[PDB]
Amino acid sequence: KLLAGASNWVNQSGSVAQFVFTPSPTQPQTYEVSGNYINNAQGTGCKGTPYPLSGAYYSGNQIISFSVVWSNASANCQSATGWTGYFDFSGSQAVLKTDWNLAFYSGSTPAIQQGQDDFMQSVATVSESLLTE
Amino acid sequence: LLASNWVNQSGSVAQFVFTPSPTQPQTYEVSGNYINNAQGTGCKGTPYPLSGAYYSGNQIISFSVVWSNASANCQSATGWTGYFDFSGSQAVLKTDWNLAFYSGSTPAIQQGQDDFMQSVATVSESLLTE
């Protein structure tokens, strides 16, 4: 906890989750999850533009579940991902480990694929301009 | 069409509210409350707020509950991801789900399936009868 305002989490395929947490008005130690997800996974669609996310986070044992619908002004992939997992802030690195489900289409055979993503916190790069570094 | 009441095979109830996303075409933000009725679980019979997103284009959804409210805490979170079928006599939502929790400093994630069916408000003549 005390990842504060906006924080940056990178998974093993280079995908980026920018979480924002707002306290739930009614749920003890629970925060509403907002922000944006940037998909960077190699063989996929809907890459490199922000998809808003929605979810909930329980600080008591640092658990989370969030979702993306893959529709925004750049690209539509007509699907939705739900991620559910837990954090470990200890040591030199903060890590979020997740299992996931994807409501999907092949033809009109609707289905749901499953998987795993592990994210690691990485704090903003500082460059002294947009043109250097 | 979807303010609407969806009942799963354990008697658990999802009351969805949908508000249009300002930036995502054919996408709605999912709010409302979830009431858990599942037999061998905690955190039963009280409202847990839910959060998610819904894509109208092919009627797909993903939503979440953190199992913490004023009645009961179960220190976990469920995420549900699936699709609707409005056709026929009955509207049905079919989902897969994942559940993050602890067992003894031991993080773990269980999974399963829930199928929900729409049922619109029953009308009684009063609270006392009929």
From Swiss-Prot, chain A:
Residues 1-124 form the Avidin-like domain. Is hyperthermostable. Displays a Tm value of 84.9 degrees Celsius, which increases to 96.2 degrees Celsius upon biotin binding. One of its GO terms (molecular function) is protein homodimerization activity. It is found in: Secreted. The specific properties of hoefavidin make it an attractive target for novel biotechnological applications, including drug delivery, nanotechnology, and molecular labeling. Disulfide bonds join 46-77. The keyword Disulfide bond applies. The C-terminal segment plays a key role in the formation and stabilization of the octameric configuration, since the short afifavidin (lacking the last 5 amino acids) is only dimeric. The exact role played by hoefavidin in the host organism is still obscure. Forms a strong non-covalent complex with biotin and 2-iminobiotin. Exhibits a dynamic oligomeric assembly: the apo form exits as homooctamers, which dissociate into homodimers upon biotin binding. The X-ray structure of the intact hoefavidin reveals unique crystal packing generated by an octameric cylindrical structure wherein the C-terminal segments of each monomer are introduced into the entrance of the biotin-binding site of an adjacent non-canonical monomer. Belongs to the avidin/streptavidin family. This is Hoefavidin. It comes from Hoeflea phototrophica (strain DSM 17068 / NCIMB 14078 / DFL-43). The chain holds residues 32 to 164 of 164 of the full protein.
